[PDB]
Amino acid sequence: ANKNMKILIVDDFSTMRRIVKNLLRDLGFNNTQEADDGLTALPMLKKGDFDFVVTDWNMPGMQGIDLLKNIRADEELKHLPVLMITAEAKREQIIEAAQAGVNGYIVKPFTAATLKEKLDKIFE
Ligand code: BEF
Numbered sequence: 232a233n234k235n236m237k238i239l240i241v242d243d244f245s246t247m248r249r250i251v252k253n254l255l256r257d258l259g260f261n262n263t264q265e266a267d268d269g270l271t272a273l274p275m276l277k278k279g280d281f282d283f284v285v286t287d288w289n290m291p292g293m294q295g296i297d298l299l300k301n302i303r304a305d306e307e308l309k310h311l312p313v314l315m316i317t318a319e320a321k322r323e324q325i326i327e328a329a330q331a332g333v334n335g336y337i338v339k340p341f342t343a344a345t346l347k348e349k350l351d352k353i354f355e
């Protein structure tokens with residue numbers, strides 16, 4: 232588990248990207264960059280050579296679910312682990328993200344404790 236892997240934090244809420252960034256720093260990860268919607272994340276992922284994606288769901292531009300499908304439906308981006316963070320706690324929606332290929336999930340609000348937990352869970 233590289234602690235200097237390039238990570239993209241996607242969320243329409245700036246403060247949330249901010250919180251995620253610091254929790255990640257707390258766990259020994261400071262190579263984070265941001266995108267405020269799935270529409271701005273894609274082009275970044277398209278040439279940024281990121282290693283990990285943490286994405287919100289509910290986003291006006293391109294919903295987090297659609298972003299993961301684009302990442303998956305893309306031969307150069309389909310190995311990217313994706314942790315979905317979001318308020319949508321409905322099982323039917325978690326299922327949907329699972330079928331779409333997400334690697335992990337985590338419901339807002341969460342702590343550094345819970346985050347690290349999820350991260351380790353993901354690396355496979
Ligand atoms: F905006 Be995410 F669905 F919390």
Ligand SMILES: [Mg+2]
Binds near residue numbers: 287
């Ligand atoms: Mg949102």
